Write an enzyme that holds these catalytic residues in place. Structure first.
Site, PDB file in Angstrom:
ATOM      1  N   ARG A   1       0.835  -1.192   0.000  1.00 16.86           N
ATOM      2  CA  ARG A   1       0.000   0.000   0.000  1.00 16.86           C
ATOM      3  C   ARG A   1       0.871   1.243   0.000  1.00 16.86           C
ATOM      4  O   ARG A   1       1.847   1.333   0.751  1.00 16.86           O
ATOM      5  CB  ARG A   1      -0.947   0.014   1.206  1.00 16.86           C
ATOM      6  CG  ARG A   1      -1.875  -1.180   1.224  1.00 16.86           C
ATOM      7  CD  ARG A   1      -3.025  -1.014   2.186  1.00 16.86           C
ATOM      8  NE  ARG A   1      -3.915  -2.167   2.126  1.00 16.86           N
ATOM      9  CZ  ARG A   1      -5.126  -2.213   2.661  1.00 16.86           C
ATOM     10  NH1 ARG A   1      -5.641  -1.175   3.299  1.00 16.86           N
ATOM     11  NH2 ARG A   1      -5.841  -3.330   2.550  1.00 16.86           N
TER      12      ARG A   1
ATOM     13  N   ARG B   1       0.991   1.230  10.254  1.00 19.30           N
ATOM     14  CA  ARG B   1       0.744   1.709   8.891  1.00 19.30           C
ATOM     15  C   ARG B   1       2.052   1.626   8.104  1.00 19.30           C
ATOM     16  O   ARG B   1       2.828   2.584   8.059  1.00 19.30           O
ATOM     17  CB  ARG B   1       0.183   3.126   8.920  1.00 19.30           C
ATOM     18  CG  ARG B   1      -0.463   3.573   7.622  1.00 19.30           C
ATOM     19  CD  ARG B   1      -1.016   4.981   7.739  1.00 19.30           C
ATOM     20  NE  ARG B   1      -2.086   5.059   8.728  1.00 19.30           N
ATOM     21  CZ  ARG B   1      -3.363   4.804   8.477  1.00 19.30           C
ATOM     22  NH1 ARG B   1      -3.777   4.456   7.268  1.00 19.30           N
ATOM     23  NH2 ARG B   1      -4.248   4.899   9.464  1.00 19.30           N
TER      24      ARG B   1
ATOM     25  N   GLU C   1      -8.429  -0.228  14.084  1.00 18.22           N
ATOM     26  CA  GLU C   1      -8.963  -1.214  13.152  1.00 18.22           C
ATOM     27  C   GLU C   1      -7.972  -2.349  12.915  1.00 18.22           C
ATOM     28  O   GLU C   1      -6.765  -2.129  12.782  1.00 18.22           O
ATOM     29  CB  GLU C   1      -9.307  -0.548  11.817  1.00 18.22           C
ATOM     30  CG  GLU C   1     -10.328   0.575  11.911  1.00 18.22           C
ATOM     31  CD  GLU C   1     -10.558   1.272  10.583  1.00 18.22           C
ATOM     32  OE1 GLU C   1     -10.144   0.720   9.540  1.00 18.22           O
ATOM     33  OE2 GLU C   1     -11.153   2.372  10.585  1.00 18.22           O
TER      34      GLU C   1
ATOM     35  N   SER D   1     -11.974  -5.371   8.430  1.00 16.81           N
ATOM     36  CA  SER D   1     -13.041  -4.603   7.792  1.00 16.81           C
ATOM     37  C   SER D   1     -13.937  -5.584   7.051  1.00 16.81           C
ATOM     38  O   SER D   1     -13.514  -6.197   6.066  1.00 16.81           O
ATOM     39  CB  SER D   1     -12.482  -3.545   6.842  1.00 16.81           C
ATOM     40  OG  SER D   1     -11.852  -2.504   7.565  1.00 16.81           O
TER      41      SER D   1
ATOM     42  N   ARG E   1       0.247  -5.230  12.102  1.00 17.36           N
ATOM     43  CA  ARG E   1      -0.575  -4.349  12.924  1.00 17.36           C
ATOM     44  C   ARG E   1      -1.108  -5.082  14.147  1.00 17.36           C
ATOM     45  O   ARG E   1      -1.099  -4.541  15.259  1.00 17.36           O
ATOM     46  CB  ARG E   1      -1.733  -3.774  12.110  1.00 17.36           C
ATOM     47  CG  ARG E   1      -2.540  -2.746  12.890  1.00 17.36           C
ATOM     48  CD  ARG E   1      -3.704  -2.201  12.097  1.00 17.36           C
ATOM     49  NE  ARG E   1      -3.310  -1.105  11.220  1.00 17.36           N
ATOM     50  CZ  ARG E   1      -4.161  -0.363  10.526  1.00 17.36           C
ATOM     51  NH1 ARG E   1      -5.465  -0.587  10.567  1.00 17.36           N
ATOM     52  NH2 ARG E   1      -3.695   0.632   9.778  1.00 17.36           N
TER      53      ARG E   1
HETATM   54  N1  SSA Z   1      -0.878   0.134   5.783  1.00 19.99           N
HETATM   55  C1  SSA Z   1      -1.144  -0.931   6.574  1.00 19.99           C
HETATM   56  N2  SSA Z   1      -0.219  -1.380   7.450  1.00 19.99           N
HETATM   57  C2  SSA Z   1      -0.480  -2.436   8.234  1.00 19.99           C
HETATM   58  N3  SSA Z   1      -1.657  -3.077   8.176  1.00 19.99           N
HETATM   59  C3  SSA Z   1      -2.615  -2.663   7.312  1.00 19.99           C
HETATM   60  C4  SSA Z   1      -2.369  -1.576   6.492  1.00 19.99           C
HETATM   61  N4  SSA Z   1      -3.470  -1.378   5.739  1.00 19.99           N
HETATM   62  C5  SSA Z   1      -4.374  -2.324   6.085  1.00 19.99           C
HETATM   63  N5  SSA Z   1      -3.851  -3.097   7.048  1.00 19.99           N
HETATM   64  C6  SSA Z   1      -4.502  -4.249   7.700  1.00 19.99           C
HETATM   65  O1  SSA Z   1      -5.310  -4.920   6.754  1.00 19.99           O
HETATM   66  C7  SSA Z   1      -6.695  -4.899   7.187  1.00 19.99           C
HETATM   67  C8  SSA Z   1      -7.607  -4.807   5.988  1.00 19.99           C
HETATM   68  O2  SSA Z   1      -7.596  -3.499   5.434  1.00 19.99           O
HETATM   69  S1  SSA Z   1      -8.828  -2.937   4.702  1.00 19.99           S
HETATM   70  O3  SSA Z   1      -8.419  -2.178   3.555  1.00 19.99           O
HETATM   71  O4  SSA Z   1      -9.518  -2.056   5.602  1.00 19.99           O
HETATM   72  N6  SSA Z   1      -9.799  -4.118   4.232  1.00 19.99           N
HETATM   73  C9  SSA Z   1      -9.495  -4.856   3.168  1.00 19.99           C
HETATM   74  O5  SSA Z   1      -8.448  -4.748   2.550  1.00 19.99           O
HETATM   75  C10 SSA Z   1     -10.516  -5.865   2.737  1.00 19.99           C
HETATM   76  N7  SSA Z   1      -9.963  -6.660   1.655  1.00 19.99           N
HETATM   77  C11 SSA Z   1     -10.843  -6.757   3.926  1.00 19.99           C
HETATM   78  O6  SSA Z   1      -9.618  -7.223   4.505  1.00 19.99           O
HETATM   79  C12 SSA Z   1      -6.753  -3.733   8.164  1.00 19.99           C
HETATM   80  O7  SSA Z   1      -7.857  -3.798   9.050  1.00 19.99           O
HETATM   81  C13 SSA Z   1      -5.402  -3.821   8.860  1.00 19.99           C
HETATM   82  O8  SSA Z   1      -5.403  -4.856   9.831  1.00 19.99           O
END
Ligand code: SSA
Ligand code: SSA
Ligand code: MN
Lengths: 421, 394
Positions: free
Chosen positions: A256, A271, A345, A348, A386
Site C-alpha cells: 500500500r 501503517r 482497526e 473490515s 498491525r
Molecule cells: N498500511 C497498513 N499497514 C499495516 N496493516 C494494514 C495496512 N493497511 C491495512 N492493514 C490491515 O489490513 C486490514 C484490511 O484493510 S482494509 O483495507 O480495511 N480491508 C481490506 O483490505 C478488505 N480486503 C478486507 O480485509 C486492516 O484492518 C489492517 O489490519
RNA sequence: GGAGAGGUGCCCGAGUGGCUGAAGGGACACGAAAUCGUGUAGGGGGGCUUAAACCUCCCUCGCGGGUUCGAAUCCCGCCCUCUCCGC
C-alpha cells in the site's frame, strides 16, 4: 458498477447514495450521456441491419445492379465505421462515469462521515496493569525484536522483525489459515500483483488508485489486499448454482502506498507499505438472505480469531461517508491499543451485493436457468504486523516479556516469547 | 567493488578475471581514467600550496562519476578450484539420495496439481503469464515449508527475520544487483524503490556504514521475504507450473564474517550443510554443482548450486545457490568491522538459499507422489501439516 | 530477449471469404445395459404486452481494431497456452 436499467428507473435512489457517500458525480450528466449512447446504438444497429442485408443480396444479384449494390454496401460500411468511432468515444466517457456510481447503502448505516461511525458491540476491555505498561515499539526494543536499520534500507513506513517475533508473525498467519480452513474456507496462496482489470473489478480503481503502487514499465500493480486477486479469479465465468457459495481464505503479501497518510502512524507496526494478510472472500447467490448469512459468518470468524488471540475488541458500524462507493454494509473490528488509549482497526467486513460482480463480470446460473450477477463479500481474517502491536501491549508481562495466547502455544512451542537482545 | 590499490599493483590478475568471467569491461580504459583522476589531484595540490582552481574541480567530478560507474563492473577473481568456462563447465561435486523407484508411471508436478485441484490456472488472466496460485493442502504446504525452514535455521544458530521485499538503489548497488542485473529487477513507479528478488538485498544493506565489533562476528541471518523478479522466463518445462515465476517466497541464509579465507570457507560449508540438511529432512534427492567462472557472477569468489531431482524430466533442478563474495559486496555496501588489532577492515559476505517456494514444491510433488495420485508428507513436515498425506480438493 | 505450434460453443474438436453462432464425437438433461429421438451460450435494441411468453434485428468464435459487398476464416495490436533456446 450498478445496474444501468435500475439507474434509469430509480435515479433519485442513486443520487441520494451519491450524497450520503460523498461521491463527486454529476448523475444528470451521466444520465444525459447514457441517453446519447443508447440513441447512437439504435442508429448503428439501423446501419448494420442494412449492411447485413446488402451483403446477403450481392452474390445472387444481376450484374447490372451488382456494381451499384456493392458501392452501396461500401458506403454503409463507411458510415457504420464513423458511428462506431463516435460510439466508442461516448462509451469510454460513460464507463468512467459509471465506475464512479456508488451502491446505495443499507438503511441501518449511519449517514455521515467518519464521525458517524458508531460502536455496536464490545467484547473484553482495556486491561488493568499492576505496572507501568510499555508501547509495542518499546517492547520490541527491550526484547531485541525491532530492526530500526530497515528505514535506511527501504525508507519510511517499513519494518523488519527479529527473533521470536519474526517466527511469531509467520505463526499468526498460519494460525489464521488453519482456522479459516477448518471453517470451510478453501485456503489459497496468491501473488501480490495484478493487471488493471482486477483493480477495476473490486472497486479499488478509480476511487482508490492513489493507494496502489504500480510496477514501472509493466501493466501490473501491487495489490493492497488479496481481495483484488480472489475477486478476479472467476471474471467472465458462469458458475453453477451448486458450487455456491464460494468461501476463499486467500493469503498474500499486501502493498500500500499510504498516500494521504502524511502524519498518521509514522512509527511502528500500524501503517506500513508492505504487510501480510489472510483474506476472507465469499461469492454467493444474488440473495439478501445469503449475503446477510455470509456477512455474519465473516464477522464471527474474525471475532473468533481475536477470541483465540485473547484480545479485547469492538465492532463498529461504518457510516455512509466512510463506507466506500461499493459497500452495502461495512463493519470494522477494532482491537484496543493501550499506548494510544483507543481502539484501532484490524479487520473490515464488507458486503457489496452485485456491485463488484457487475465490474468483474461475476455471474452464476440459478436453478431456474437464469444467469444472474453474484453477490460478493470480504473480510480480514488476520493481518500482520498491525495485530502484533495489540498483541505485544495486551500480553506484556511485568518484567517486559510478552506472553503467547493459549491457541498460539502449539505454533510457537513456548508460553512466553524469548528475547533476542 | 575491488580494492583500488590491489587493482593498480596487479592489473594482470584482474584482466584474467574479466576474461574467465566474460565481463564486457575495458580495464585499460579504466586504468587510464584512474591515472587521469590522479593527474587532476596533482594539479589541485599545487594550487592549495600556492577561478582556475574551480574549473579543475568541475572536471574532477565528471571524471570521478565516470570512474565510479566503471569500478562497479570490475569483477572479483574466482578461486582456482572453479572450472573456467560457461554453464557447460559446471562440475558436479557429489549427489546424495537416489532417484525414486515407482511401480507406476510417474506424473509431472503440474499433472499432480491438476488431478488434486491444488492449482489455480485462472491466475494467468488476473496477474499475467509466469504466475502461480495454490489451493487446498498445497497452499498450506507452501506456508508450512516456509515456517519449517525458519524453525530449522533458528535452531542452527541463525537469527530469523521477516523482511520487506523493497529497497532503495543503494541496497541493490551494495550487493551487486545494480548495475549488472538491473534488468532483472522491478521498480515501483513514482517511488525511489525497487522490488527485491532476494532477501540478500535487505540483509546485506542493514549494516551499511557501521563498524561492527569483532566479537559480534560472524553475523548469521535467516531472513524471510517475498521475492520479485522481472524475468521469470517465457514458456516450456523450464518455467512451467511452479518452476519459474515473477513472485515467490524465499528464506535466505546470509553470513557476514571477518576478512579471512578460513572464516569464509567455514561459513560457506555451514550454508551448504544447512541447505543439505533441509533437503535431507525434506526427503529429496539432491546434488551439489561447482559453478564455473563464466556462470558465476562478477562478485563471486566461489558458487555452489544445489539441485534436486525431478523425475518427469529425469534431470536435476536448481533449488539453492550458495555464494562467497569475500569483500566485493562489503566494499560496495560499506560493510566494515574492527579486527582484534583495532584496525578497520572490510568484512566478508556470504549467502545461500535456505528454502524457496514454490519451486521446491515441484520436486516434492513428483518425488513423493503415490500411485493413486496423492502426495505424501516427509516426516519432518508432518507436525507442520497435521497429516501424513496431502488430501485433494477438486 | 527469440523460434515454432495454437486459442471456436459444456469439453475435444470441422471450418484454406458467404452454403457456419456454427458439422461430427463425448458429456449432461429430458423423453421414448445398449441403441434411437429431443434439448444444451451470453449481451443489447425494437414490436406486442402490465408483465411474461412470442416475433424480429444487432454484437460476440481469447479481447480490441482494420480489409472487404460480406470475416469464426484474411491483416494489425494486445492477452493467454504448449514445446525448444536466451538471461
Ligand atoms: N498500511 C497498513 N499497514 C499495516 N496493516 C494494514 C495496512 N493497511 C491495512 N492493514 C490491515 O489490513 C486490514 C484490511 O484493510 S482494509 O483495507 O480495511 N480491508 C481490506 O483490505 C478488505 N480486503 C478486507 O480485509 C486492516 O484492518 C489492517 O489490519
Ligand atoms: N523466478 C523464480 N521463480 C521461482 N523460484 C525462484 C526464482 N528465482 C529464484 N528462485 C529460487 O530462489 C533460489 C535463489 O535464487 S538465486 O538467485 O540463484 N540465489 C539468490 O538469490 C541468493 N541470494 C541465494 O538465495 C533459487 O535457487 C530458486 O530456488
Ligand atoms: Mn521473455
Amino acid at each position: 458498477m450498478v445496474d444501468l436499467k435500475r439507474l434509469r428507473q430509480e435515479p433519485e435512489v442513486f443520487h441520494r447514495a451519491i450524497r450520503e457517500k460523498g461521491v463527486a458525480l454529476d448523475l444528470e450528466a451521466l444520465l444525459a450521456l447514457d441517453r446519447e449512447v443508447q440513441e447512437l446504438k439504435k442508429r448503428l444497429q439501423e446501419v448494420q441491419t442494412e449492411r447485413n442485408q446488402v451483403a446477403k443480396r450481392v452474390p445472387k444479384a444481376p450484374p447490372e445492379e451488382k456494381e451499384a449494390l456493392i458501392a452501396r454496401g461500401k458506403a454503409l460500411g463507411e458510415e457504420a465505421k464513423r458511428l462506431e468511432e463516435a460510439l466508442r468515444e461516448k462509451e469510454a466517457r460513460l464507463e468512467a462515469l459509471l465506475l464512479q456510481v456508488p451502491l446505495p447503502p443499507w438503511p441501518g448505516a449511519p449517514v455521515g462521515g467518519e464521525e458517524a461511525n458508531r460502536e455496536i458491540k464490545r467484547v473484553g476491555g482495556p486491561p488493568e496493569f499492576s505496572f507501568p505498561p510499555l508501547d509495542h515499539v518499546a517492547l520490541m526494543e527491550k526484547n531485541g525484536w525491532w530492526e530500526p536499520r530497515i528505514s535506511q534500507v527501504s525508507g519510511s513506513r517499513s519494518y523488519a522483525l527479529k527473533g521470536d517475533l519474526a517466527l511469531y508473525e509467520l505463526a499468526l498467519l498460519r494460525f489464521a489459515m488453519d482456522f479459516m480452513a477448518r471453517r470451510g474456507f478453501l485456503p489459497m496462496t496468491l501473488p501480490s500483483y495484478a493487471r488493471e482489470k482486477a483493480f477495476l473489478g473490486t472497486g479499488h480503481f478509480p476511487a482508490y488508485r492513489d493507494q496502489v503502487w504500480a510496477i514501472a514499465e509493466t501493466d501490473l500493480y501491487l495489490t493492497g489486499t488479496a481481495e483484488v486477486v480472489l475477486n478476479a479469479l472467476h471474471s467472465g465465468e458462469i458458475l453453477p448454482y451448486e458450487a455456491l457459495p464460494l468461501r476463499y481464505a486467500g493469503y498474500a503479501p499486501a502493498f500500500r502506498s499510504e498516500a494521504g497518510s502524511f502524519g498518521k502512524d509514522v512509527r511502528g507496526l500500524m501503517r506500513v507499505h508492505q504487510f501480510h494478510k489472510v483474506e476472507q472472500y465469499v461469492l454467493t447467490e444474488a440473495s439478501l438472505e445469503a449475503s446477510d448469512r455470509a456477512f455474519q459468518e465473516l464477522l464471527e470468524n474474525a471475532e473468533e480469531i481475536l477470541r483465540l488471540l485473547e484480545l479485547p475488541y469492538r465492532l463498529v458500524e461504518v457510516a455512509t461517508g466512510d463506507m466506500g462507493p461499493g459497500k452495502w454494509r461495512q463493519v470494522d473490528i477494532e482491537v484496543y491499543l493501550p499506548s494510544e488509549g483507543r481502539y484501532r482497526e484490524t479487520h473490515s467486513c464488507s458486503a457489496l451485493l452485485d456491485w463488484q460482480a457487475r465490474r468483474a463480470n461475476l455471474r452464476y446460473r440459478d436453478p431456474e436457468g437464469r444467469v444472474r450477477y453474484a453477490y460478493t463479500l470480504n473480510n480480514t481474517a488476520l493481518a500482520t504486523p498491525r495485530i502484533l502491536a495489540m498483541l505485544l501491549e495486551n500480553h506484556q508481562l511485568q518484567d517486559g516479556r510478552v506472553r503467547v495466547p493459549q491457541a498460539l502455544i502449539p505454533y510457537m512451542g513456548k508460553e512466553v516469547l524469548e528475547p533476542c537482545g
